[PDB]
Design a protein around this ligand. Structure first.
Ligand code: 2PG
Ligand code: MG
Ligand code: MG
Ligand code: MG
Ligand code: MG
Lengths: 432, 433
């Protein structure tokens, strides 16, 4: 049973308050923290902020902390349920909140506890956390993912004008996870100098996820820079490109504006079909193997058309919000073929696991993901191994809210010793 | 005693390899990592790098890892010493390396084991790490430091022309540590908008330490932005400013280059005296209360002149290198009145604790410090509280290699409860509370 739960307000990687939960059992202390998105989809579970304009610019999480401390904490303790009983414990919390979108407590309140529970569970099972998650998911194998490194950072929040949010490199050709980290870091440092040589030093600072926002419009130019860095580093045969367009961020009146980061202008807008044709060119002309959120979260027609006309990975993020209800719709409509897995878009371990399973049962890939506001928490490193999904995105190899996950994945790899396999070229369907 | 040690390569916050050590006892697994500087003084202990150009562009730390695994580890198991014996264990490594600057095994090998020992020692005592540290250093009455947030990045930490390295905010008038994190974070958010308004959204990406890296040259303009953000956030009476010039970084044939990242042009070089006058202008025009490495690491008379002609805190970093020999010279010559405390400039916990005590015995301040390149490790949070120094600089409130420390400082404050005392206006001198 749970002995004590105690939440507090810590700061995330952008300097904003977020929830952290300590849970005590007879096995000791287990700590977890909650991430927070910037480009958040409209269908994500509620992130409860205080909105006290005078305190932390309305971003405090004092209310979510109080729901855990004053409400969740004593209920869960009183149940006497064991921390191994993840599903029981998550469900009690959902019922206590009584709202579909977790708007009574906040998804941030529920998730902090869910995460701390899962870590306690592991200990009570005397297993490492990735093995506990594996068993929670019914997996009897494990695999290290190909990491996807967001090296050219962009979007609605972008220290810059580029419309599409993320330009990632994936070392599919690497020998192991630790080698994938080498290839990513080397290409990162090479890209820094390509940017400096072309754009000057001013352009070598970093964005929220640790990548660069050189000052460019054309998304093709971001791909060209990434392609150059990969080649200058000597890894053309081994590294390919994934994108996150985050198209819901520049959806305007039924169309799409490839410059929305400038002062408004209805005249620069294009149709979904024009957007689709641009992506076909990117896939022909660059080693682009995955595109995430190519259209808006509500533009179902565009998704299903695009996905049927390509062979690449198409990742739902804002479309799917790690939510089994939306995933079902996406499966029926053949909208996408990969799920982005964000524990905080849904708000419990149990539901994210259910979402992963649903995608997988249906022939989808799954890419585990950070949020752009992260913490020192490294849960998602054990989750991606435990769920055997083969791919994770959790930042450039820069800023340690990113590296803490990458370094944990290297530890899990070393830990598996001989037993370690690396997804490599089968990142889309590692189950082989 | 030590059951097993195992070291590995991990990546630091700039994506460079660094040393991590796992150390096992009957209590369990204790883990620490080693940070890495960019603007590194010539007198720092040796950071051993592999130099293999077909691996991490020369920056691997496989050699230090192997030193730890194959040679340091059996030495310490063999010793049979309890992990509570920080000093004995450190001394065994210092003697086994047997060089002045730790150039056989690397300061990074030694320090990675030193920190894991100290974590394990705290567990063996059944104490929190800050308390264990306290006992090692002979303190009892712990204090929470004022944090020094480096909210605009320049020098070798940023893509910009701005030559001086660090522009910091200190919430001396905060009510608690948790309150100082709120002040710091509000000024930092406010500053984002002052910068975006004047210079563009493209000016608000960040440097290595999480501060904004706007495309400015004039150091006075960095101060002006910070002062504006302070006033706009409503905290003028409660937050003051600190700098790390990192002058060794721009010292050129006996002069100083405030546009050092621009193609070399010696016509633009200025003298020590001219730099010192600038600092006087900054002191009179802005609430600057601390200035770090105002002169080159070997420019002793400039330091001594300047220090004698100001009433503020003057911090040795590259001057002193957390090294008792250099600190002693600094004391005799009145070169500065504060020590920047960096575990990896000297290479062991024991030496860092001795350096601190030396400084505090001589009436100096001590400011505990991260490096440019940090990790998820949080040791320096427990260290600054255990050493009761009253002041820490460990980044802007941005990038979690910085927040991990600040967050840990909040948890320690929580742990101490009504036993928690914040240094506040006594940051230079908190023994008085
Ligand atoms: O000069 C310094 O004080 C440090 C700390 O910010 O920077 P670096 O670690 O690069 O020396
Ligand atoms: Mg998003
Ligand atoms: Mg996305
Ligand atoms: Mg330096
Ligand atoms: Mg310095």
């Amino acid at each position: 049973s749970i002995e004590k739960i105690w939440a507090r307000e810590i700061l995330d990687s952008r300097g904003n308050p977020t929830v952290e939960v300590d849970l005590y059992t007879a096995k000791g202390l287990f700590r977890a923290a909650v991430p927070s998105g910037a480009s958040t989809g409209i269908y994500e579970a509620l992130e409860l902020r205080d909105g006290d304009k005078q305190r932390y610019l309305g971003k405090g999480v004092l209310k979510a902390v109080d729901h855990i401390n004053s409400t969740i904490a004593p209920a869960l303790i009183s149940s006497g349920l064991s921390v191994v009983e993840q599903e029981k414990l998550d469900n009690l919390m959902l019922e206590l909140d009584g709202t579909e979108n977790k708007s009574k407590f906040g998804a941030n309140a529920i998730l902090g506890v869910s995460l701390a529970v899962c870590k306690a569970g592991a200990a009570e099972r005397e297993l490492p956390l990735y093995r506990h998650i594996a068993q929670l998911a019914g997996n009897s194998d494990l695999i290290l993912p190909v990491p996807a490194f967001n090296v050219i950072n962009g979007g609605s929040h972008a220290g810059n004008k580029l419309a599409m949010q993320e330009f990632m490199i994936l070392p599919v050709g690497a020998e192991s996870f630790r080698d994938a980290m080498r290839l990513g870091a080397e290409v990162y440092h090479t890209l820094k100098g390509v940017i400096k040589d072309k754009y000057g030093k001013d352009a070598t600072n970093v964005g929220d996820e640790g990548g660069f926002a050189p000052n460019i419009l054309e998304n093709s130019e971001a791909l060209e820079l990434v392609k150059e860095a990969i080649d200058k580093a000597g890894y053309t045969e081994k590294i390919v490109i994934g994108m996150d367009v985050a198209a819901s961020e520049f959806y305007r009146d039924g169309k799409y504006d490839l410059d929305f980061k400038s002062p408004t202008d209805p005249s620069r807008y294009i149709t979904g079909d024009q957007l689709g044709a641009l992506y076909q060119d990117f896939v022909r002309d660059y080693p682009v193997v995955s595109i995430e959120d190519p259209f808006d979260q509500d533009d179902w027609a565009a998704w299903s058309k695009f996905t049927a006309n390509v062979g690449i990975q198409i990742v739902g993020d804002d479309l799917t919000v790690t939510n089994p209800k939306r995933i079902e719709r996406a499966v029926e409509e053949k909208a996408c073929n990969c799920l982005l897995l964000k524990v905080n878009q849904i708000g419990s371990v149990t539901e994210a696991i259910q979402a992963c399973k649903l995608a997988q049962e249906n022939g989808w890939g799954v890419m585990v993901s950070h949020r752009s506001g992260e913490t020192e928490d490294t849960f998602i490193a054990d989750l991606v191994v435990g769920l055997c999904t083969g791919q994770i995105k959790t930042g450039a190899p820069c800023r340690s809210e990113r590296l803490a996950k990458y370094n944990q994945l290297m530890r899990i790899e070393e830990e598996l010793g001989d037993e370690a396999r690396f997804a490599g070229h089968n990142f889309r369907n590692p189950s082989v």
